[PDB]
Symmetry: C4
């Protein structure tokens, strides 16, 4: 109809209720489920769907062997109905590639997929299910993007890309697209020293992205974007409640404009909702591996370098595998506020479970409640032994 | 379009004709059919569909082992086209949880799923396929609901929940929702001493629910709701034709305001149509197990403590497994009256058929005819031996 | 929109072109295809689809054992997209039963399914996908109907049923339905002595049904219906080109008002287009079994007792299995005439191929061309050996 | 809405970006994927889909044995969602036959399928999913057509057929259809000596077809059609950059009006975009087999007999199997120009990989970019060893 505008503020997050779970690995043990990774969730005005990077093979198929690898010519961004698994028969291909982002602007959807060899990748921007724009690698080193939904405001949908080293300074750009065409792009500015896989959400005409400093930071970099002025700033979450993984143990004071040191060249895509006292952080429970997952209310996390949790909710037990996590919201829901949501990728197989030769995942996602709901844990649920 | 209003009375029930049967277990022996239980049927203005609680695995899948269990993080309310089986590929997830209800109000559908551990469950009310309201456990003991469709009138859709003991007095509430939001809730009142899994239907602006007294009653409690005044009453079916299972043998006089004694802490979800002489009761044939199923015309069953059958129809032979049963009607059919319908859950596997490690079911459903139709029996039809 | 009216005459049939083929048995050797029989084809104003009586199991499934049997509680009328096979995932159940008919009246579709034991069957008439009317067995001996599409004119859709003996005189009725309700019914009149499984089509406000005299006739009975007056007549195809199976060898003169003798108590559902010189007859090639299939132009077959072929076209070789055949036309096609069409059921398995324990079929269908097209044969194509 | 008119010119082709890839053979190793060959891509105003000639069996099915053969009664033109594989469950049959073409005219789609024995084939033209016209073989020798999409302009959709010898002069005709009816047909004229499988595209009211001279030419014949005048001309691509396969090595001067000699009676369906300096040619890398695939910018290839490449892009490595290739464009995209696209059939199995008994393929397709994008190779990706 008309372009959606971020006119509402976030609803108060007093807890998280279950939104979707596909039990993909369990079900795929005996049905035609595609092997995937790098999932996310994104809504259209009339429907919300699961998204992910297929590996171009079923889990039980012999080609599942080797799916731990990230970039092949057999990957593609696919979407499928909420809480269903990604099967060969219900998965809709949005585009071909090994890194992506996607978002609806109110009128139609923009999907971006990047493909290519390491030194010659290219992004192709699709809008209304047609290819519209293409961007060639600028640093010749794995051009890559969010791996979660982008956000739009009055037709403008900013997307953060990175090209160059993952263990050194790199060339990050914020592109502002409208109807799949480039209106403008900027180099990253601010104090964030390295950006990877941004998780974004919008409220009251501002887009907040919580990303990953793969190079040095265990605290998360944050990019706040003004989609009207088409400008942005960057910093780190000040809080001592560190949210990357692997990471050092929590200090009593964090860092606002530098990476918090202790762990280099590694990290996991994650997210957060930064809204004054209504601030919640997601992180794996383990400081060593992609294990477990919890949500922590850390009032003023972004700006208070001594902020510590005041409430919390466990999502996945530390005795269960987790993985990537990101944000999305249904901007077309009824009500006066935007209900914060997120998904957690539950990785199974390699590298942690090497008795099988594949790597895949299932998805669990939650949204906020203004109630103070009882909590439960949500594991993948599959028995690797069955696959042997 | 506009909210549906219960303006018609029931059609005269002279017999029952076959409406839907999915042969799920038979078909699932060699195709991707989800393991389910707690099925039901519910109509939208333009389509009627089967519903059930998936177990998050196929019947032939190795994860089918253990599906006798009731509440896991892998369950979800799913719906699929009438008389098809619930397959991995045609099943639509309405919400995540291990207890549910759902109904269309004329404009859109409300679905409710409860999930959580035993002492910390929570219901989340979905409307127009979006989460709208959440209710936290009030008694911290398996918050649970109908397991069959709710009914709406002018936007108001009452739902009966129970929280607390299943073998003692508990905290039952009647919630009145409108567009997924709570307008009001009451504690259970009347003479019903314990309520579990209500089966409901509406006619001439009154909603009748036949439930289950798991604690002491072999006769069924009944909750009649006024969705305009948003008030209700409760009593038991007076008839000596006892309809719970397990149950004592039929007496010559029943009880109107107390459970009929003889069997404690057990029962099966069931239903009835209470309409003066046009009154029909469903019950298993066996007084000992979920075996067989028959419909009995017991004029004035609700109010006459000596009422006995005047007509009958066998649905499932006592030599075949049955299970839960509930009511639904197509409130959007043509005609001057509402045609009473019901479904019977045909449980296969555990606990009665323990040579297999799973528990699932198929569905058979009938609707009334003003004709006096010949009868046939409708078993599940699968051979357990094939699954070994 | 508006009720369709049979305002056109048939197009000139100079040959038959391929219309649809599903290769169901071939494909089903390694995919989830339902076992079926008694197929047909029927069009809606915007789509034409294949129809059949499922057996409630896949071909490779263990429950396929025994599918030679005709009436079980596991059968249902299903429809699916033209030329696709009937799979567990794309098949839409129209109703439950072991005998059926279906037709679109221009506004919506009427489907009829009969179920029950031999002495207590009942038909239930569905309209706009809802149950509307029910008819109880009148002779208590396998109430049964067409097994191919009915035809409508200004809302009136006549259907021929038979109840009683298949090897003696029986009680055949012509029902005239409108919006799923009975307007009127007649007993069979005319000279046809026994009616089974009528194949019908309409043109210029007249409905012609070519049926099967299972009792004594090797020539086919024909019922012509006036859907406005709601009256009919019956006779036999006069032609010596006998079209039932099994059958005696062709004589030089046929019979107009009596069964042509030579074979008792057996026959196959078949059809014909009776239109003066534009008359074509379908029949198996073998006079002994459901083997092969050919179309023969026999000018004035209905009324000329010495009529012999003037042109012909082989559809299936005598070295391939055939089965039932019936008529349908797309009454919503462009043009000034109705293009005659038909389908042939290609039965595989039992009883002729007993190395397998199942019985199923695939479908091939053709429509007429005003061209004189080259011919090809269209077998099922599956290798039974593969199923062993 | 209204008939589409070729009002735009081609966009400048500076490189090719990835458009679609279905990874069919990989995925089909463990899921219900139909065996196919002779694929292509074609767009409707609201969707673009993959097309191909199914073999009426899955790849893993036992009937896959023998699929190297070209014409059987089990083949059919099927279409399915872009980048999905052709599965038994998502494939839509357009018509029955072993040679086809299809195109949307703006209002609805025309599909053509030819079937029959070698000496008695016939084409049947479908429009709006209904059969409309039929054409009988004129030379009684494998009537056949494009195997890729046709193109329409103001309702007129020309199609090139060939009937007669594939290794000698034959009878090629250009038919001009409108709403599935024949407006006119011509015999082939010009200097092209033999025409097989034309690949076409349209721009500024002219339709260009790059075909295959199976008889003598290693350079490609080209048919340019005026769909308004309904007239055409024919010649060969003048360029010494030979694009058929097998073929001699490139000379320094090509031939404009005769086949370039060196290889007889063989060839592969291919294509090209002939647009002055914006001219690109596709060809296999190997001059001996259907191996590898590259795009070469050969300014003025059609008219300059000494034209050599000025830019290039590898699509498939010479160490990977390729096959047929053809053109299509989305005539309903936004923008001021038509973006040239093409697909490459990646054949697997027989005859080159004879350890398996089947022959199938997967599809990769690209479209042009005005950017100078980095290149990657796009192989089928399946391991034949897995199928053994
Ligand atoms: C039914 O459901 C309800 C609803 O969920 C249940 O009630 C919930 O119970 C939760 C668990 O108790 C509770 O969650 C906790 O909240 C704490 C904050 O609340 C308390 O403090 C505030 C502030 O003063 C008070 O207002 C309040 O009254 C409470 O006293 C959090 O602090 C908790 O998180 C911390 O502990 C968990 C382990 O429990 C860690 O995993 C987590 O990371 C937090 O601790 C680490 O991080 C901090 C900050 O740096 C460190 O100080 C600390 O040492 C830990 O650090 C180590 O561990 C981390 C992670 O491994 C590592 O990185 C680091 O290096 C160190 O090794 C927790 O979130 C809910 O708030 C509460 N909800 C409600 C509404 O009440 C109820 O129990 C359920 N009922 C039943 C019967 O079960
Ligand atoms: C073709 O189709 C038609 C249409 O269906 C067939 O006709 C139908 O035939 C049915 C079976 O005969 C018949 O059903 C019965 O109707 C009885 C009522 O009708 C009779 O009584 C009235 C009242 O005076 C008369 O008007 C009427 O003319 C008849 O005489 C029911 O009473 C029957 O139910 C009872 O019996 C069945 C077993 O048959 C039990 O399973 C059932 O539970 C009922 O009996 C138990 O319950 C009562 C009440 O408490 C007890 O008194 C009794 O002892 C039984 O109790 C034991 O068993 C129960 C259950 O196990 C247990 O809980 C308890 O503790 C005790 O152990 C039955 O419903 C249809 O009405 C009739 N329909 C029509 C339209 O005619 C026709 O036969 C078919 N044709 C062919 C050729 O087959
Ligand atoms: C390319 O394609 C074209 C287009 O299809 C091919 O041309 C077609 O060729 C067809 C086969 O030749 C041909 O079909 C036949 O037509 C005959 C009628 O035409 C002839 O007679 C008329 C009338 O005088 C002439 O006008 C005309 O010029 C011809 O001379 C039919 O009579 C044929 O059917 C009979 O034979 C077939 C076997 O071929 C039987 O299966 C069939 O049942 C018919 O014969 C039985 O029935 C009759 C009637 O009672 C009996 O008299 C006779 O003895 C047979 O009876 C026995 O067999 C039956 C069945 O088993 C059994 O019940 C009974 O008891 C007895 O045992 C046949 O239909 C097409 O018309 C023709 N089409 C066109 C447009 O030309 C062309 O060949 C192809 N090209 C190539 C290169 O292959
Ligand atoms: C990142 O991505 C970019 C973007 O893709 C990469 O840059 C691209 O690199 C490509 C490969 O180098 C390049 O493709 C070539 O372009 C040549 C034309 O450019 C050159 O010549 C022009 C003209 O003077 C200059 O303007 C220009 O500056 C260049 O110098 C083509 O000529 C190339 O094709 C020929 O070679 C390939 C093998 O490389 C053959 O397969 C192909 O068939 C061509 O050669 C055959 O055909 C010709 C013509 O008849 C014969 O003369 C020749 O002998 C060969 O003939 C034999 O082989 C054929 C086929 O087997 C056989 O039939 C015959 O009988 C003989 O046996 C090639 O297309 C892109 O243009 C370039 N793109 C851009 C934008 O720059 C970049 O490298 C990537 N980066 C990294 C780090 O990898
Ligand atoms: C088929 O015939 C009936 C007439 O018998 C047509 O019905 C008339 O249609 C118009 C528009 O619907 C009404 O105003 C008339 O009263 C209708 N009916 C009768 C029964 O008189 C019908 O429109 C015809 N069908 C089609 C497709 O033209
Ligand atoms: C393509 O060209 C034809 C004109 O040749 C356009 O047809 C005219 O369209 C309008 C609206 O449909 C009619 O009133 C004219 O009479 C049409 N036709 C002719 C043949 O004169 C057509 O609209 C054009 N297509 C598009 C998408 O614009
Ligand atoms: C931070 C992005 N990088 C470094 C290039 C990664 O390796 C990502 O790591 C992971 C990962 O789980 O750590 C998954 C993604 N598939 C990778 N992205 C790409 C484009 O390969
Ligand atoms: C009466 C409801 N209760 C007691 C909590 C049950 O155990 C139900 O029993 C049965 C049952 O078949 O008896 C099935 C339901 N899955 C159970 N419901 C829940 C929420 O677990
Ligand atoms: C002529 C109809 N009769 C006799 C009842 C049949 O047996 C039919 O035979 C055949 C048949 O292939 O001969 C198939 C049908 N499934 C049967 N119909 C029913 C209702 O069982
Ligand atoms: C050039 C067309 N001809 C000669 C008849 C072919 O054999 C084609 O060859 C090939 C081929 O891959 O060479 C595939 C097509 N399936 C064939 N077409 C038909 C109609 O059989
Ligand atoms: C395939 O067919 C050939 C030829 O009929 C036969 O020899 C061969 O054994 C078959 N192979 C398989 C695997 O069926
Ligand atoms: Ca399988
Ligand atoms: Ca890090
Ligand atoms: Ca009880
Ligand atoms: Ca007979
Ligand atoms: Ca050639």
């Amino acid at each position: 109809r008309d372009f959606n505008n971020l006119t509402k503020g976030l609803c108060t997050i007093n807890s998280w209720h279950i939104y979707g779970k596909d039990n993909a690995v369990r079900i795929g043990e005996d049905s035609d489920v595609l092997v995937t990774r790098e999932p996310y969730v994104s809504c259209d005005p009339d429907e919300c769907r699961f998204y992910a990077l297929s590996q171009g093979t079923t889990i039980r198929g012999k080609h599942s062997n080797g799916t731990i690898h990230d970039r092949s010519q057999y990957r593609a961004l696919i979407s499928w109905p909420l809480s269903s698994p990604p099967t060969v028969y219900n998965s809709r291909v949005e585009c071909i590639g090994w890194s992506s982002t996607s978002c609806h602007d109110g009128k139609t959807r923009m999907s971006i997929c990047i493909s290519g060899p390491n030194n010659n990748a290219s992004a192709v921007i699709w809008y209304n299910r047609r290819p519209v724009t293409e961007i060639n690698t600028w640093a010749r080193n794995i051009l890559r993007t969010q791996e979660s939904e982008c956000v739009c405001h009055n037709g403008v949908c900013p997307v953060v890309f990175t090209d160059g080293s993952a263990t050194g300074p790199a060339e990050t750009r914020i592109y502002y697209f409208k109807e799949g065409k480039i209106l403008k792009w900027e180099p990253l500015a601010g104090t964030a020293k390295h950006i990877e896989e941004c998780s974004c959400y919008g409220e009251r005409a501002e887009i907040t992205c919580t990303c990953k400093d793969n190079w040095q930071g265990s605290n998360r970099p944050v990019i706040r974007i003004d989609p009207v002025a088409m400008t942005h700033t960057s910093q780190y979450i000040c809080s001592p409640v560190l949210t990357d993984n692997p990471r050092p143990n929590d200090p009593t004071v964090g860092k606002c404009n530098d990476p918090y040191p202790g762990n280099n060249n590694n990290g996991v895509k994650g997210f957060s909702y930064l809204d004054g006292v209504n601030t919640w952080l997601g992180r794996t429970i383990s400081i060593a591996s992609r294990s477990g997952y919890e949500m922590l209310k850390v009032p003023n996390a972004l700006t208070d370098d001594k902020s510590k949790p005041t409430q919390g909710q466990t999502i996945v037990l530390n005795t269960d595998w987790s993985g990537y996590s990101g944000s999305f919201m249904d901007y077309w829901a009824e009500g006066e506020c935007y209900r914060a949501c997120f998904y957690v990728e539950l990785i199974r197989g390699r590298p942690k479970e090497d008795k099988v030769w594949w790597t895949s995942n299932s998805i669990v996602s939650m949204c906020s409640s203004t109630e103070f709901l009882g909590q439960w844990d949500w594991p993948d649920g599959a028995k690797i032994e069955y696959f042997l």
